[PDB]
Design a protein around this motif. Sequence first.
Motif, PDB file in Angstrom:
ATOM      1  N   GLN C  11       1.109  -0.965  -0.037  1.00  0.00           N
ATOM      2  CA  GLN C  11       0.137   0.020  -0.104  1.00  0.00           C
ATOM      3  C   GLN C  11       0.797   1.476   0.056  1.00  0.00           C
ATOM      4  OE1 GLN C  11      -3.758   0.417   2.395  1.00  0.00           O
ATOM      5  NE2 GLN C  11      -2.531   2.290   3.387  1.00  0.00           N
ATOM      6  N   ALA C 100      -1.182  -9.344   5.892  1.00  0.00           N
ATOM      7  CA  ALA C 100      -1.751  -9.337   7.257  1.00  0.00           C
ATOM      8  C   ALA C 100      -0.682  -8.728   8.294  1.00  0.00           C
ATOM      9  CB  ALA C 100      -2.165 -10.647   7.909  1.00  0.00           C
ATOM     10  N   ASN C 101       0.223  -7.806   7.755  1.00  0.00           N
ATOM     11  CA  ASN C 101       0.988  -6.785   8.872  1.00  0.00           C
ATOM     12  C   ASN C 101       2.143  -8.080   9.090  1.00  0.00           C
ATOM     13  OD1 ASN C 101       0.002  -4.619   8.185  1.00  0.00           O
ATOM     14  ND2 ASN C 101      -1.595  -4.505  10.019  1.00  0.00           N
ATOM     15  N   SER C 178      -1.138   5.801  10.916  1.00  0.00           N
ATOM     16  CA  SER C 178      -1.744   4.451  11.280  1.00  0.00           C
ATOM     17  C   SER C 178      -0.620   3.431  11.242  1.00  0.00           C
ATOM     18  CB  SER C 178      -3.014   4.330  10.472  1.00  0.00           C
ATOM     19  OG  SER C 178      -3.708   2.968  10.842  1.00  0.00           O
ATOM     20  N   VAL C 181       1.070  -3.050  15.453  1.00  0.00           N
ATOM     21  CA  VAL C 181       1.972  -3.254  16.800  1.00  0.00           C
ATOM     22  C   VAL C 181       2.964  -3.775  16.265  1.00  0.00           C
ATOM     23  CG1 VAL C 181       0.624  -5.197  17.419  1.00  0.00           C
ATOM     24  CG2 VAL C 181       1.576  -3.562  18.931  1.00  0.00           C
ATOM     25  N   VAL C 182       2.945  -4.599  15.346  1.00  0.00           N
ATOM     26  CA  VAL C 182       4.328  -5.513  15.070  1.00  0.00           C
ATOM     27  C   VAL C 182       5.278  -4.740  14.030  1.00  0.00           C
ATOM     28  CG1 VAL C 182       3.062  -7.743  15.626  1.00  0.00           C
ATOM     29  CG2 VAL C 182       3.155  -6.690  13.292  1.00  0.00           C
ATOM     30  N   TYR C 224      -3.140  10.263   4.032  1.00  0.00           N
ATOM     31  CA  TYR C 224      -2.079   9.954   3.085  1.00  0.00           C
ATOM     32  C   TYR C 224      -1.767  10.541   2.056  1.00  0.00           C
ATOM     33  CZ  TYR C 224      -1.629   5.540   5.757  1.00  0.00           C
ATOM     34  OH  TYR C 224      -1.443   4.516   6.863  1.00  0.00           O
ATOM     35  N   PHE C 404       3.741 -11.605  19.911  1.00  0.00           N
ATOM     36  CA  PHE C 404       3.305 -11.898  18.532  1.00  0.00           C
ATOM     37  C   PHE C 404       4.247 -12.707  17.655  1.00  0.00           C
ATOM     38  CE2 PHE C 404       2.119  -7.739  20.201  1.00  0.00           C
ATOM     39  CZ  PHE C 404       0.751  -7.528  19.930  1.00  0.00           C
ATOM     40  N   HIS C 406       4.561 -15.748  17.770  1.00  0.00           N
ATOM     41  CA  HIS C 406       3.830 -17.117  17.052  1.00  0.00           C
ATOM     42  C   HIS C 406       3.194 -16.798  15.597  1.00  0.00           C
ATOM     43  CE1 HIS C 406       0.496 -14.859  18.784  1.00  0.00           C
ATOM     44  NE2 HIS C 406      -0.232 -15.691  17.993  1.00  0.00           N
ATOM     45  N   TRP C 407       2.839 -15.673  15.258  1.00  0.00           N
ATOM     46  CA  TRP C 407       2.320 -15.338  14.188  1.00  0.00           C
ATOM     47  C   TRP C 407       3.370 -15.702  13.228  1.00  0.00           C
ATOM     48  CZ3 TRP C 407      -2.636 -15.222  13.292  1.00  0.00           C
ATOM     49  CH2 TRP C 407      -3.429 -14.630  14.375  1.00  0.00           C
TER      50      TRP C 407
ATOM     51  N   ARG D 161      -7.999 -20.542   7.765  1.00  0.00           N
ATOM     52  CA  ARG D 161      -9.080 -19.474   7.899  1.00  0.00           C
ATOM     53  C   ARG D 161      -9.269 -18.897   9.431  1.00  0.00           C
ATOM     54  NH1 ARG D 161      -8.277 -17.230   3.408  1.00  0.00           N
ATOM     55  NH2 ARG D 161      -6.285 -18.357   3.841  1.00  0.00           N
ATOM     56  N   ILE D 162      -9.597 -17.662   9.446  1.00  0.00           N
ATOM     57  CA  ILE D 162      -9.624 -16.923  10.801  1.00  0.00           C
ATOM     58  C   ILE D 162     -11.056 -17.410  11.469  1.00  0.00           C
ATOM     59  CG2 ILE D 162     -10.138 -15.023  12.134  1.00  0.00           C
ATOM     60  CD1 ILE D 162      -7.296 -15.326  11.520  1.00  0.00           C
ATOM     61  N   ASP D 196      -9.596 -17.627  16.806  1.00  0.00           N
ATOM     62  CA  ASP D 196      -8.495 -16.637  16.794  1.00  0.00           C
ATOM     63  C   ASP D 196      -8.896 -15.322  17.771  1.00  0.00           C
ATOM     64  OD1 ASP D 196      -6.652 -17.845  14.992  1.00  0.00           O
ATOM     65  OD2 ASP D 196      -8.532 -17.820  13.795  1.00  0.00           O
ATOM     66  N   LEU D 245      -7.090   2.071   6.780  1.00  0.00           N
ATOM     67  CA  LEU D 245      -6.394   1.353   7.584  1.00  0.00           C
ATOM     68  C   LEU D 245      -6.471  -0.330   7.264  1.00  0.00           C
ATOM     69  CD1 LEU D 245      -6.989   0.817  11.539  1.00  0.00           C
ATOM     70  CD2 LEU D 245      -8.725  -0.187   9.999  1.00  0.00           C
ATOM     71  N   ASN D 246      -7.323  -0.621   6.196  1.00  0.00           N
ATOM     72  CA  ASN D 246      -7.309  -1.833   5.594  1.00  0.00           C
ATOM     73  C   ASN D 246      -7.442  -3.145   6.435  1.00  0.00           C
ATOM     74  OD1 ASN D 246      -7.127  -2.932   2.772  1.00  0.00           O
ATOM     75  ND2 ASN D 246      -5.819  -1.573   2.485  1.00  0.00           N
ATOM     76  N   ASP D 248      -8.812  -6.546   7.815  1.00  0.00           N
ATOM     77  CA  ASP D 248      -9.441  -7.828   7.611  1.00  0.00           C
ATOM     78  C   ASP D 248      -9.457  -8.421   8.842  1.00  0.00           C
ATOM     79  OD1 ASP D 248      -7.152  -9.507   7.490  1.00  0.00           O
ATOM     80  OD2 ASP D 248      -6.692  -8.479   5.806  1.00  0.00           O
ATOM     81  N   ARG D 250      -7.662 -11.226   9.772  1.00  0.00           N
ATOM     82  CA  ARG D 250      -6.131 -11.791  10.170  1.00  0.00           C
ATOM     83  C   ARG D 250      -5.540 -10.456  10.766  1.00  0.00           C
ATOM     84  NH1 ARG D 250      -5.734 -14.733   6.223  1.00  0.00           N
ATOM     85  NH2 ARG D 250      -6.024 -16.500   7.487  1.00  0.00           N
ATOM     86  N   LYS D 251      -5.516  -9.268   9.858  1.00  0.00           N
ATOM     87  CA  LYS D 251      -4.845  -8.114  10.583  1.00  0.00           C
ATOM     88  C   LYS D 251      -5.331  -7.764  11.726  1.00  0.00           C
ATOM     89  CE  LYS D 251      -2.875  -5.433   6.546  1.00  0.00           C
ATOM     90  NZ  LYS D 251      -3.182  -4.413   5.710  1.00  0.00           N
ATOM     91  N   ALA D 253      -6.513  -9.849  14.183  1.00  0.00           N
ATOM     92  CA  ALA D 253      -5.890 -10.928  15.215  1.00  0.00           C
ATOM     93  C   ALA D 253      -4.665 -10.663  15.361  1.00  0.00           C
ATOM     94  CB  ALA D 253      -6.387 -12.345  14.601  1.00  0.00           C
ATOM     95  N   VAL D 254      -3.816 -10.381  14.320  1.00  0.00           N
ATOM     96  CA  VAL D 254      -2.384 -10.046  14.476  1.00  0.00           C
ATOM     97  C   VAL D 254      -2.088  -8.745  15.540  1.00  0.00           C
ATOM     98  CG1 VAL D 254      -0.271  -9.132  13.142  1.00  0.00           C
ATOM     99  CG2 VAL D 254      -1.674 -11.186  12.273  1.00  0.00           C
ATOM    100  N   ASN D 255      -2.756  -8.014  15.380  1.00  0.00           N
ATOM    101  CA  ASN D 255      -2.612  -6.851  16.171  1.00  0.00           C
ATOM    102  C   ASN D 255      -3.282  -6.897  17.585  1.00  0.00           C
ATOM    103  OD1 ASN D 255      -1.254  -4.514  14.591  1.00  0.00           O
ATOM    104  ND2 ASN D 255      -2.514  -5.382  13.117  1.00  0.00           N
ATOM    105  N   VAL D 257      -3.690 -10.051  19.240  1.00  0.00           N
ATOM    106  CA  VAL D 257      -3.196 -11.321  20.021  1.00  0.00           C
ATOM    107  C   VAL D 257      -1.787 -11.545  20.242  1.00  0.00           C
ATOM    108  CG1 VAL D 257      -3.889 -13.718  20.056  1.00  0.00           C
ATOM    109  CG2 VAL D 257      -5.478 -12.292  19.155  1.00  0.00           C
TER     110      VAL D 257
END
Lengths: 344, 54, 438, 423
Positions: C11, C100-101, C178, C181-182, C224, C404, C406-407, D161-162, D196, D245-246, D248, D250-251, D253-255, D257
């Motif tokens: 992005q 997913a970041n 924006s 966290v990771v 942005y 984080f 484990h991701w 899948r989440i 998740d 901020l886009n 979904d 999974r994003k 859960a990543v932020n 958990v």
Amino acid sequence: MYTFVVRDENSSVYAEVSRLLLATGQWKRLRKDNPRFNLMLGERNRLPFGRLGHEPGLVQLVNYYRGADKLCRKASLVKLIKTSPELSESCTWFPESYVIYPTDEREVFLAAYNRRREGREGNVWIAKSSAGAKGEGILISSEASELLDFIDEQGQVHVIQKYLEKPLLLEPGHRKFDIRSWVLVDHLYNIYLYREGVLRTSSEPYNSANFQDKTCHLTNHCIQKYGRYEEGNEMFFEEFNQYLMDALNTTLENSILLQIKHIIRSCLMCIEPAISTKHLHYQSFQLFGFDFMVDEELKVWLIEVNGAPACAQKLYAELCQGIVDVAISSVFPLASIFIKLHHH
Amino acid sequence: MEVIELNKCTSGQSFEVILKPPSDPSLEEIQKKLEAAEERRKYQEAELLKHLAE
Amino acid sequence: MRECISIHVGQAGVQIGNACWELYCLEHGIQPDGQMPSDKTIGGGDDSFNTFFSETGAGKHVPRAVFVDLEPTVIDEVRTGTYRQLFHPEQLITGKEDAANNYARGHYTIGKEIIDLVLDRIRKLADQCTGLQGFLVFHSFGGGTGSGFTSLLMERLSVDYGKKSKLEFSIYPAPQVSTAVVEPYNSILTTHTTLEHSDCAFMVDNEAIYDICRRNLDIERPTYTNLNRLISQIVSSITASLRFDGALNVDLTEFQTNLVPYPRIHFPLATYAPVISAEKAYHEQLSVAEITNACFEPANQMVKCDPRHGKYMACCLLYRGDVVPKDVNAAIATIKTKRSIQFVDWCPTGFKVGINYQPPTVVPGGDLAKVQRAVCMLSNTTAIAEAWARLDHKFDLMYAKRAFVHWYVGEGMEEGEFSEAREDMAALEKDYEEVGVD
Amino acid sequence: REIVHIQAGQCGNQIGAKFWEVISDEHGIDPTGSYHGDSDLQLERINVYYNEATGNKYVPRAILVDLEPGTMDSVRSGPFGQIFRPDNFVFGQSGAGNNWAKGHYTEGAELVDSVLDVVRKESESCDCLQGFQLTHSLGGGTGSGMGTLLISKIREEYPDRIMNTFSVMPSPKVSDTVVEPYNATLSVHQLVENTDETYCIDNEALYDICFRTLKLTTPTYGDLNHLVSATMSGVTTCLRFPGQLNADLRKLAVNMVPFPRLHFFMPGFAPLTSQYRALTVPELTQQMFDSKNMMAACDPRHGRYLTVAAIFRGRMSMKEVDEQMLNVQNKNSSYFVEWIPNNVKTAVCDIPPRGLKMSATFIGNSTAIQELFKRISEQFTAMFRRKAFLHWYTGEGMDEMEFTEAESNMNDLVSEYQQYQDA
Ligand SMILES: Nc1nc2c(ncn2[C@@H]2O[C@H](COP(=O)(O)OP(=O)(O)OP(=O)(O)O)[C@@H](O)[C@H]2O)c(=O)[nH]1
Ligand SMILES: Nc1ncnc2c1ncn2[C@@H]1O[C@H](COP(=O)(O)OP(=O)(O)CP(=O)(O)O)[C@@H](O)[C@H]1O
Ligand SMILES: Nc1cc(C(F)(F)F)c(-c2cc(N3CCOCC3)nc(N3CCCC3)n2)cn1
Ligand SMILES: Nc1nc2c(ncn2[C@@H]2O[C@H](COP(=O)(O)OP(=O)(O)O)[C@@H](O)[C@H]2O)c(=O)[nH]1
Ligand SMILES: [Ca+2]
Ligand SMILES: [Ca+2]
Ligand SMILES: [Ca+2]
Ligand SMILES: [Ca+2]
Ligand SMILES: [Mg+2]
Ligand SMILES: [Mg+2]
Ligand SMILES: [Mg+2]
């Protein structure tokens, strides 16, 4: 409200500042490593200035100026004074000084010493280092050869400075002294000299014969431990001024304090472009301890600048409160004991 | 303070001012790492599916 | 004439590339349909702008750019926006679901499945080049794709184009703008893997851009779009030498040669002036002395840090507009006597200066006022290591609890890559300290 | 990026139905599935939750599951009952008698393949399935037992899948049977391993909010469900609307958990009012962080926040939002772990919910949630140590060991939270 962190547990001054902040009901102390602070009372060494000023929405202030070590290390003070055109080689209030490693000024020191030995002028020098903390690692000698061997035994940088053979001696006692002045520089780079200084006195008569005995020659409070003339070998300004009036028909302000103010202004204005935090993403203030000597012609000489000074016991209250009013609450207001040294 | 190497065209100019003189991994190695990560994903998924079959 | 291929990843990389190519088209008189009325050589040429643009027989001027993202929504805006006619569809590459970041997801899991397609599309642009200089790579540090897919791409570009130069424009994470966290994890993992493969990287801290936009443009809450138009002015001033006649930084190699004496320490600090509000009806035009002075104000740097407490290894001034060498030297003279500018002992104290007479172009209706002269300073100062220390410290706080992690392990990455990457950054911080501190 | 929605059992279907009423209204969808909105922002991401049938009709990607027909007859008779795809009602006749074992092992096992057939038919027509969300209670039999069986079969068929749940926790204050602590403890064990993200909705907190704050002398399930559907609309706002901020699943859960087992969230909503008065940004921010506004009956000052997401809806001062969010952290500086930098995220969406000019939704991953699991574990042990009411479960083929294991795992979860609360 406001938040602060404490990272120098060994600071007498900022323990009292911390105590004052808490007892306003508007400051909260956080854990050492919480980044969400308004105010950092930082560590003496390796302070992480690079992590300051990146917290969104926090105005952040720290009690040290990054770069002020240039003034507050004996070696760099000498280099600063020599190579700064505003201080110049022509500076008249700093004793002749050379930096010596065991860049290096070993040869040029002997060249002036030769002129003194040939000249039969008073050829007594003192060798020291900021690495010689609290009364350790100082040698006063009339022979240049003996001074250098002392430096080579230790493995750290030293400065060789002309010992002032003709100091002003207090009477009675025929005794040496030095003057400590506390100076607060705030975030706007206003320079505030605290009204009260202290004379650290020697308890034993000055003896120009042997410099082997370092007690009547080293004014350091730790070295004096004594106390018969004044409580704790400390004389305050009201008494010293009354002494100068009675014994010398002059005042502290005229004979000494004008020079002290000139020297403080000169040193701190010199490094202002390098350390000012105007237009920085974080702000600094710092409390400085300037140490001066006075000779028998009532000329004032700068000895060193301390970057993390302690205070005289009966002055901690007043001065620490002044730090809060002038340095902290000026940035973080809640719901004069200083003399402002005006400049540029 | 000397100016050197001054070059001029109709669009602009460039030059140098001197104030003071002075005093790889292969393709196979990448695909190995990619496939090693894929097999670790495959191992963990099989452990999951084994756990679910139990 | 030697071609340059731009690659925009994720992005941040895609949206910034949009802002850049919009500005390039304005700067070169290319309309959104690709036509360029001033280019009297139809269907070909080797002018200076041809390093960034190819030409069809129809007279369309086509960016030498690939856009890559692992989900389609950002690049779909390109396909439907103002400049849709500019790009060939093959140039705009999207996958189905993003990283997913997660660096490990962009690099290993999804990277593995799309990297050959990206290379194939890049090869097709390269096959149109008579003398490819190399690549300009635009990406965030913090995104799963910008970090993880870029690092894979950079490795494969070294394999496939070993003699070619690679420059980066990297968006460094700031919580104001924006963030995930990771993003400290992703930033370190990608810097470790990319370090050997980048010849010169221009870091832009979103905190600094955000603050310039609030302070100089009086924008309360920058978007942005606000950020990207400011970034694109800085990028344009860095790349103007490749796209216009000139003698300074005329090919990608010259960036290393002039700014990077030590390969690992390849992160020059960019400073830009002036940034003036377009809404500001009353504006007094700044002089060469003043815009040059502003180059030594931390408030105008692309990364907030203090050069006064670092050392310089190299320093380039890139001016645009009404500037002549006489004024530059008079300004430099004054500034050297007034500021803390210390070079390392083994480098000459001096400045390489380039002047382009065309003043900065600004987007019509945008936030930047048109100015008579501007400057971008590129200086390689050890002070930028402050940005590495900040990032490394945030990484340490999280990694000590394995928060984080484990991701990343779940995508097939080994935990060892974390400490490996972190030890590389610790060595990087030590290199900066050795170069810059007494 | 489609989401497949599943609602199981009485609680799950009644809260599910209200969720679809609320978001159908926000997206401009009438009870017949026709769009009648006035803003393209309504349709931009509508495919996340709706399929497009011919004739420009929108059909919830929703699967309605139960082991007795009663609550799903009510839904079909309800206000928006006609939008649901009739093929997506999957029900038995036996019931599960508030018995996890019947839901998970006996009655539920006979029905579950039919449910997976519908799930598979919805997933197959997804351009790019994000994952699944399940609404259910943990204190009954179908939502609790068959719901978690479904989660396990979905994970096996779609391991990448989440999986998200909105899970209603039982409370003696709003209780149907005494076996709820058994059913909830067996369920938490499943959720620890196979979701998740779980939004923990405590019927104790919902009751207290209705009684103390909303001044409802006698709350009904209808009253508790108004709070749930509003919270569900808030937490899914950033999935349903063209907010930047886009985000979904999974994003998200990543932020949120940082450790795989610690994925149980405390939700909150503001305002809750017992009104036409303008609610200022300071008020929204203060309220959304107040314990009285949270839907898990846990005091956040009894623990520490690992991560927080805060979603503001309406037209308001972004600068004032950033300002107040940074302010509330300083008044609560102790209550955020210092070893996850910048662990509070603020999102804004211009579309306000129905009848409010602005609102705020809170999602906290706090170690205080251990209080909820401690409550349940206490109630479980008080009965289990005397093996009370166990025959209902051993009569369905379960052994005592399985109860011991689920209790052990929940007490492990509690001590895990305590461990990070002191880090
Ligand atoms: N300056 C600027 N920063 C951006 C922009 N878009 C995203 N960012 C920053 O980039 C980081 C997020 O990474 P993205 O580039 O959005 O992620 P990505 O590469 O698409 O990877 P995914 O995880 O797959 O979505 C954050 O630190 C954002 O602040 C942009 O257009 N301009
Ligand atoms: N050039 C000089 N001439 C005469 N006396 C000197 C001198 N330099 C130092 N001294 C004496 O030696 C003492 C200690 O010197 P110095 O201050 O440099 O060491 P120090 O840093 O360990 C103690 P402090 O921190 O209080 O200044 C001074 O109090 C002064 O009396
Ligand atoms: N229901 C929701 C809603 C959101 C919301 F609205 F997007 F903020 C989020 C969320 C997203 C997010 N991001 C980050 C990167 O961009 C994608 C969205 N980062 C965070 N946080 C919380 C802890 C610190 C980061 N939380 C999670 N669940
Ligand atoms: N908040 C809420 N809780 C409910 C509702 N219906 C039942 N419950 C609670 O859910 C549990 C009973 O489970 P239920 O869903 O009725 O059983 P199931 O049909 O077998 O899944 C108890 O904790 C009830 O308090 C409802 O509509 N709203
Ligand atoms: Ca041409
Ligand atoms: Ca290479
Ligand atoms: Ca049967
Ligand atoms: Ca079947
Ligand atoms: Mg000292
Ligand atoms: Mg993306
Ligand atoms: Mg029931």
